[PDB]
Amino acid sequence: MKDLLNLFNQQRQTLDFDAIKIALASPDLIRSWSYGEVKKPETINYRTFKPERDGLFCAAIFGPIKDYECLCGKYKRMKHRGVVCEKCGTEVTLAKVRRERMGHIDLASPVAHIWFLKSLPSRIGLMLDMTLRDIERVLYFEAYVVTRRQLLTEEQYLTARQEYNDDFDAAMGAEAVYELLRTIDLQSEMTRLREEIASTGSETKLKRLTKRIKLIEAFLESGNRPEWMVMTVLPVLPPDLRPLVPLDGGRFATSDLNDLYRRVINRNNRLRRLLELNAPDIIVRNEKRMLQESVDALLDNGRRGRAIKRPLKSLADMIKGKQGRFRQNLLGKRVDYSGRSVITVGPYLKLHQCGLPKKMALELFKPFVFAKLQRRGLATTIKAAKKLVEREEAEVWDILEEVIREHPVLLNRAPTLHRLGIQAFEPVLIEGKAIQLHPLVCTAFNADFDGDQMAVHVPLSLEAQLEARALMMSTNNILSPANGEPIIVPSQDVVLGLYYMSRALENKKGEGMVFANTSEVKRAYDNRVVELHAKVKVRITQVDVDKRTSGTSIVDTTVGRALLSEILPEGLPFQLANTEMTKKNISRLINSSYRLLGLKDTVVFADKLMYTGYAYATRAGVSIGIDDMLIPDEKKGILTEAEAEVLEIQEQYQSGLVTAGERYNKVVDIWSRTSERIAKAMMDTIGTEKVENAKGETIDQKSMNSLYIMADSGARGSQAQIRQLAGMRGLMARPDGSIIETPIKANFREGLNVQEYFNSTHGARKGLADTALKTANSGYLTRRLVDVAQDVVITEIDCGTTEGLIMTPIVEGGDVVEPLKERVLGRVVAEDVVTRNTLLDEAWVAKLEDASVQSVKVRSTISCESSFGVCARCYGRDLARGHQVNIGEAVGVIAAQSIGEPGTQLTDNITVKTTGSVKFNNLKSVAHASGSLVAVSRSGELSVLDGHGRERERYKLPYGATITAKDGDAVKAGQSVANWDPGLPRVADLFEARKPKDPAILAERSGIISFGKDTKGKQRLIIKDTDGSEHEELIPKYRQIIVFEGEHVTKGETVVDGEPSPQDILRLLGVEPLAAYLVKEIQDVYRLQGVKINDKHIEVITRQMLRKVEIVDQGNSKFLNGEQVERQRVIEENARLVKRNELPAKYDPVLLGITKASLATESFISAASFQETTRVLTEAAVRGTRDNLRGLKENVIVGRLIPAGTGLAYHAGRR
Amino acid sequence: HARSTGPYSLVTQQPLGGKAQFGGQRFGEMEVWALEAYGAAYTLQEMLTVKSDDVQGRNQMYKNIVDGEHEMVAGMPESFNVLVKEIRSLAIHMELE
Amino acid sequence: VEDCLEVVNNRFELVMMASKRARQLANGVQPLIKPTVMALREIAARRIDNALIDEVEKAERERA
DNA sequence: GGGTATTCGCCGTGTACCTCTCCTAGCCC
DNA sequence: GGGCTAATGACGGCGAATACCC
RNA sequence: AGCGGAGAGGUA
Ligand SMILES: [Mg+2]
Ligand SMILES: [Zn+2]
Ligand SMILES: [Zn+2]
């Protein structure tokens, strides 16, 4: 019950090992693991509190209930150890022995395991070459097996026994399958099935034959007997693993496994009594079937019969699932030295520190307070120190303020999305019961102050403080891991004051005078002799970097921009801050301050900028009211004109001229036009509202209204939110997909009736439902994207290959999405166009911008020659840190957290527009009869060329399109050169790589077009070849088939229009168009949504997706097996260097899904942690694999250091 | 609320949960990924094994903090022992090689 | 934390070097000029390197 | 013979916190 | 009351199993 | 005296 001298037994276990091996369990191993058998089901004796002898909670089998005590009391001292009694033999050992050892059940009849039977790759059906229903009828006593293998009922059994004269024995149940698994010899069966695979050539028979050959090979390599599938001795759990929790009033709570164990023991005792008393055979078969169903319900409840109004858990339910042990007590465990609070914004603290309550600081750092009180000598024992702490003297607060001066803590919001959710701060002691936080930190946390909670964590080791200070402090996490923009952006309160401060008007007081420097401006502003904004001419001094070169010039600016020139560092020029401080302008200013200056000066500049914005926002005093929100004057006239127009349209529709659909379409068209006109009039009457005078003459300027400043300065809603508050909100939608015919002809300032409110509720609730479903799907996609790529770490400094990709700024036929400056920045080039194997900084991309370059060969991470990861020179430049990627930083988890983060936010004639020339690539023009130019091609590319050298847009040229001009012709804007007459599931569909609804059928190889063959239920499409035969296949007869007879098909064209499959485009050409298509589609989706994500985070994922490869010839390994690239390349180089000249064969790449790559890995621990634990455990049970222990999850599960980050030299010195 | 030393369970040697009965806050599954994205194996091993799960490290770290010395002992947690003793009760041999 | 980025190229090597330095100041070592800030100042002052840490570790192992 | 065409079954569905009650039960003296 | 005594209001994706026209 | 599982409600 209570032990005292056992607490100081330190250094009792080492647990030094290398690998984890799992295999089947022999019955002798189960008989040697246990310490006794059980025969009477009784877990708690009644009318007395003693454990039952030979029961579920026993003492002679497992151990004593009390520490160093026995049941009766003959030996009740610690001096007697290892001495058992005679009436109740309990080993007088520690209380820890009740968890290690276990017991066993002697079964009179055998019973088969359900994990090797009810699983979909059924191993017994592959071993005995039978189906699942036949062995289901045999194992549950409904058929017979003679001993060649066939289903046989009772009438065939009696008619065979009447003619065999007791010479044809046939068993039924577990004994027949036990004899069938025992009497087989797998060594001759391997050669027999090898002759069978040498004879039979059917494809599904080939797949079944290679599966059976691989299973037999794994069984003979592991050494496991085939009879170990069925079992005779069934072990039980230790009694300390499950508790018998009492309730109020002397009761006991129910359990799940104890009732199943008591049922198993009761059925086993009944079967043993019926076998001893020589029962008739039908009740013995019924008892054996009942015992089989009871054991099958104990092993996996809910798979066969769901034996109960709530089905209780079993041994397979409390491991696999949501409440399993892998996701509750292995990956994330509850830790101590923690606690939540309520966040509160505090402006009087720096960004490297945070607030902390005093009682929380006393309760968290209590052992440090005890150590300081022991060192100072004010308290002798820890009890007196604890009583002095709880008595709350004044020296306790002095000790608490002294003990944490530069000791960092950890802060973490409980809903976290990206890697910046855990930061470190140096806490200070404040009053209250709320944690004070810096306002610039909450942009990264995405934490609103409407009662949000975050849990703190206290690093207490000697190395954890250095790990939290050197790489987790808030002054080091400046840039986001997604893109190069810094996360220190001024929020809704700072940028409003900075926009009010850094603008100008027409005529204010104190203008026209010349100032000396910034100090004269600060001396003349505070006594209110000049205005906050006036057109003045000041003189400023700024140094020049090449190196420091001071310089004094003159400039004309405002008073607020001159007052802003005192807090910026000397490396920034004044031309980057003379513009009005908007959101993107100050983001560019923060990026330019971080780029070529440093870190600490940018940190203190962001510190002073928030204080300046606060001190000017408390002086501005902006307020929005009912007078500032204005309505347009012509709004009622435009509304009455539109009302007369829709009344005329309704009269013409009801008179019997136009149908209802076209009338509804023209009504919503003219109402959308009216809404656009109302929005334009509202923007014109809001932006150009204010007027002023300059020397008597009136002049127009930008208005200084409350709504217009918050609209133009950013950190608020868009122009649609201003349209909904000034003019009409347009047409609302319906949940089924249609648009309501009646509009909402009133803003939020005017009153609203019940009809438009009920119409707006439909659009209001659907957004909430979409955000909830998007949050759930974003969490699921984040978990899958983390678990698919977690082994890619930076191992080496160079690989050696120079394959690379072709980076080109993609265009679609309009404005550019990303330029070449945004795509090649932060990468490593492959070959020279600028030398090779160099890093492209912000200056090199500007030097190569004016060189008129089009495509640069860039080494990407999808083609590397490293082992168990990628190297540093191939990954490129890091996005979080501005320097080069260090050796040991994992990039898979960062890419997964970057991809899975914005998921909760996500839901005839071609006229040119640029001025320049036109280029012709991948096209062919034929001579027209009228002398014009007409292009003939399967897929053309009509691209243009600007004056700088980059393509502005690119169109497509269909079959027979007439182009108005030729190549090199000058085409201006607005000209017509073409003449021819006719979501988050989408993101998950590329990662899981499923088949589409109407998949596009692609060509087989580079062959000429042939004529269509005869049909026999499906269309046949033949292709003419040069030397080989014709490659023909089937075609769907439902959709349209467009194959040209007298034409020529290029190398891998298409014949059916639609979205193509990734497996077909992988089988066709290779991995580079697949990678380009995947990155292009994901980037177009994320640019249609509005969040920018760098390409290398997608390239790492699609490199991890293409891991398993197949071979077309068996040199040393099997034929249909799929192994990784690294092991196949190592064994190929080994067979080519040691065995012979060219021993192995060539490998072909194949594509798998994210779940298919997360399940079929080399190890078994990380693959059995998120999905399908039973199938992975069943596969690893019959294989006998050995875990190499190399990953970023299995080291967390085992408990050692991860091989990424600080714990790299430990793994370097271990091997 | 806050706590340093609290009660432990019987199945796994872990602290409880909730403001009542002195339950520590649960370290989430995504928080371990956010820690491993920074690297920092020393603050991930100390916040998973010697803080909560170990039956000897939870006393040894407290003794080293109160006394003054700095020498930690790394070992396997009790939850992995409970998991392997649960797997061994399913007629599947699993030994720490 | 900003000055130590120029003396070494690897951040994890800096963390392991400061961890090897922190195991000596706890047992009692006279400083150069909280042990974390003092060790970071001794690193950033270009005084403590990988050879001197090995020298003090060998002296501690010989004087144990 | 044979090569897919439905068809049945297995797999899964975010994180963290706060509060409350109710559990094994039943049956002839 | 008492003391031991034993439902039908989920939905999508993927792999094996007959099976039916050819 | 510490330790359990279900049902409902609420904040982010
Ligand atoms: Mg909030
Ligand atoms: Zn005894
Ligand atoms: Zn490489």
Q: How many domains does chain C have?
A: 1
DSSP string spanning A427-487? EEEESSSSEEE-TTTHHHHT--SSS-EEEEE---SHHHHHHHHHSSBTTT--B-SSSSSBS
Closest CA to A279 of A291, A287, A289, A269: A287
> Where on the phi/psi map is residue A61: left (φ > 0), alpha (ψ -120 to 50), or beta?
alpha
The burial of A924, by beta-carbon neighbours within 10 Å (0-12 exposed, 13-18 middle, 19 or more buried), is given as exposed
**Interface test mutation site (partner A, options C8, C10, C11, C37, max chain A beta carbons within 10 A):** C11
Name the residue range of residue C58's domain.
Answer: 1-64
How far apart CA A799 and CA A840 sit, in angstroms, is 19
How far apart CA A99 and CA B81 sit, in angstroms, is 9
Phi, psi torsion values for A133, nearest 5 degrees: -70, -35
> Is any Cβ of chain A less than 8 angstroms from the Cβ of B82?
yes
Phi, psi torsion values for A919, nearest 5 degrees: -105, 150
Query: Is residue A785 within 8 Å of residue A1100, measured between CB atoms?
Result: no
What experiment produced this structure? cryo-EM
Residue A353 parent element (H or E) = strand A353-357
Residue A109 parent element (H or E) = strand A104-112
Secondary structure class of A412 (helix, strand, coil): strand
Give, as one character, the DSSP assignment of residue B22.
G
The burial of A507, by beta-carbon neighbours within 10 Å (0-12 exposed, 13-18 middle, 19 or more buried), is given as middle
Strand E–CB A1017 distance below 7 A: yes
CA distances (Å), origin A1201, targets A437, A467, A790, A1207: 32, 14, 15, 6
Query: Is residue A546 part of an annotated ligand binding site?
Result: no
Residue A1111 parent element (H or E) = strand A1108-1111
Which residues of chain A lie closer than 8 angstroms to C34, CB-CB? 405-407
Which chain F positions have some atom within 7 A of a protein CB?
Answer: 1-6, 11-12
How far apart CA A741 and CA A668 sit, in angstroms, is 6
Beta bridge partners of A551: A542
Count CA within 13 A, CB hemisphere, residue A553: 11
Secondary structure class of A1084 (helix, strand, coil): helix
Query: Is residue A679 within 8 Å of residue A638, measured between CB atoms?
Result: no
DSSP string spanning A675-706? HHHHHHHHHHHHHT--EEEETTEEEE-----H
Q: Which two tokens stand for residue A618?
A: 């408390």
Query: Is residue A510 within 8 Å of residue A530, measured between CB atoms?
Result: yes
Cα angle, residue B38 at apex, residues B33 and B44 outer, rounded to 5°: 65
Query: Is residue A744 within 8 Å of residue A728, measured between CB atoms?
Result: yes
Strand D–CB A1017 distance below 7 A: no
State, as a whole number of angstroms, the distance between the CA of A1000 and the C1' of D18: 54
CB distance A462–C19 less than 8 Å? Answer: yes
Which chain D positions have some atom within 7 A of a protein CB?
Answer: 2-4, 9-19, 23-24
Q: Which two tokens stand for residue A357?
A: 């309550």
Give, as one character, the DSSP assignment of residue A1059.
P
Q: Say if strands A1147-1149 and A1123-1124 run parallel, antiparallel, or are unpaired.
A: unpaired
Q: Say if strands A453-457 and A338-345 run parallel, antiparallel, or are unpaired.
A: antiparallel
Cα angle, residue A744 at apex, residues A742 and A750 outer, rounded to 5°: 150
How far apart CA A695 and CA A684 sit, in angstroms, is 26
State, as a whole number of angstroms, the distance between the CA of A1025 and the C1' of E21: 32
Query: Is residue B39 within 8 Å of residue B61, measured between CB atoms?
Result: no
Helix A583-595 / helix A600-620 crossing angle, nearest 10 deg = 150
Secondary structure class of A554 (helix, strand, coil): strand
Phi, psi torsion values for A131, nearest 5 degrees: -85, -175
Residue with tokens 């877990």: A43
State, as a whole number of angstroms, the distance between the CA of A239 and the C1' of D23: 22
Residues near A153 by beta carbon (within 8 Å), at least 6 away in sequence: A143, A144
How far apart CA A572 and CA A1095 sit, in angstroms, is 30
Domain A634-767 -> CATH class: mainly alpha
> Is any Cβ of chain C less than 8 angstroms from the Cβ of B70?
yes
Which one of C12, C15, C26 has the shortest CB-CB distance to B70? C26
Residue A552 parent element (H or E) = strand A549-557
DSSP string spanning A595-629? HTT-SHHHHHHHHHHHHHHHHHHHHH-----TTTS
Residue B93 parent element (H or E) = strand B92-95
Give, as one character, the DSSP assignment of residue A875.
H
R_g over Cα of chain A: 39
Strand F–CB A243 distance below 7 A: yes
Q: How far is C46 from chain B (nearest CA, A)?
A: 24
Query: Is residue A375 within 8 Å of residue A480, measured between CB atoms?
Result: no
Secondary structure class of A943 (helix, strand, coil): strand
The distance in angstroms from the start CA to the end CA of chain B is: 43
Residues near A518 by beta carbon (within 8 Å), at least 6 away in sequence: A538, A540, A562, A563, A565, A566
Query: Is residue A952 within 8 Å of residue A811, measured between CB atoms?
Result: yes
CB distance C12–B39 less than 8 Å? Answer: yes
Which residues of chain C lie closer than 8 angstroms to B40, CB-CB? 15
How far apart CA A264 and CA A244 sit, in angstroms, is 19
Cα-Cα-Cα-Cα dihedral sign, residues A751, A757, A759, A760: positive
How far apart CA A1199 and CA B46 sit, in angstroms, is 10
How far apart CA A1187 and CA A1178 sit, in angstroms, is 16
Query: Is residue A869 within 8 Å of residue A793, measured between CB atoms?
Result: yes
Closest CA to A419 of A471, A481, A475, A469: A481
Q: Say if strands A961-963 and A933-935 run parallel, antiparallel, or are unpaired.
A: antiparallel
Q: Which CATH architecture has domain A492-620?
A: Orthogonal Bundle (1.10)
CA distances (Å), origin A280, targets A274, A285, A287, A895: 9, 9, 11, 68
How far apart CA A567 and CA A561 sit, in angstroms, is 11
Phi, psi torsion values for A771, nearest 5 degrees: -70, -35
CA distances (Å), origin A511, targets A129, A307, A476, A520, A560: 98, 89, 43, 14, 13
Contact partners for chain B, using 3 or more CB pairs closer than 8 A, are A, C
**Distinct helix (H) and strand (E) counts, chain B:** 4, 1
Residue A957 parent element (H or E) = strand A954-957
Give Dmax over CA atoms of chain B in angstroms. Answer: 47
Query: Is residue A951 within 8 Å of residue A945, measured between CB atoms?
Result: yes
Compute the distance from residue A340 Cα to the ligand 1 centre, in Å. Answer: 15
Beta bridge partners of A111: A231
Our CA dihedral for A471, A477, A479, A482, rounded to 10 degrees, sits at: 70
How far apart CA A1215 and CA A1192 sit, in angstroms, is 17
Count CA within 13 A, CB hemisphere, residue A477: 28
Closest CA to A424 of A464, A483, A481: A464
The distance in angstroms from the start CA to the end CA of chain C is: 33
Which one of A242, A890, A1181 has the shortest CB-CB distance to B37? A890
What's the one-letter identity of residue A1084? D
**Distinct helix (H) and strand (E) counts, chain A:** 39, 31
How far apart CA A27 and CA A294 sit, in angstroms, is 20
Strand E–CB A253 distance below 7 A: no
Which residues of chain C lie closer than 8 angstroms to B69, CB-CB? 26
CB distance A471–C15 less than 8 Å? Answer: yes
Q: How many Cβ atoms sit within 10 Å of the Cβ of residue C38?
A: 16
Q: Which two tokens stand for residue A60?
A: 């002679």
Q: Which two tokens stand for residue A575?
A: 């031309």
Phi, psi torsion values for A1187, nearest 5 degrees: -75, 125
How far apart CA A992 and CA A1006 sit, in angstroms, is 29
> Is any Cβ of chain C less than 8 angstroms from the Cβ of B67?
no
Residues near A669 by beta carbon (within 8 Å), at least 6 away in sequence: none
Residue C8 belongs to a domain with what CATH number?
3.90.940.10
Helix A257-276 / helix A281-299 crossing angle, nearest 10 deg = 160
Residue at minimum CA to C1' distance from nucleotide D23: A253
Give, as one character, the DSSP assignment of residue B49.
I
Compute the distance from residue A734 Cα to the ligand 1 centre, in Å. Answer: 29
Q: How far is A1038 from chain B (nearest CA, A)?
A: 47
DSSP string spanning A261-275? HHHHHHHHHHHHHHH
Count CA within 13 A, CB hemisphere, residue B14: 23
Cα-Cα-Cα-Cα dihedral sign, residues A1064, A1067, A1069, A1073: positive
> Where on the phi/psi map is residue A656: left (φ > 0), alpha (ψ -120 to 50), or beta?
left
Residues, chain C: 64
The distance in angstroms from the start CA to the end CA of chain A is: 44
Give Dmax over CA atoms of chain A in angstroms. Answer: 130
Query: Is residue A274 within 8 Å of residue A287, measured between CB atoms?
Result: yes
Give Dmax over CA atoms of chain C in angstroms. Answer: 36
How far apart CA A592 and CA A545 sit, in angstroms, is 13
CB distance C1–A475 less than 8 Å? Answer: yes
Q: Which two tokens stand for residue A805?
A: 């990709």
Give, as one character, the DSSP assignment of residue A793.
B
How far apart CA A1105 and CA A1152 sit, in angstroms, is 7
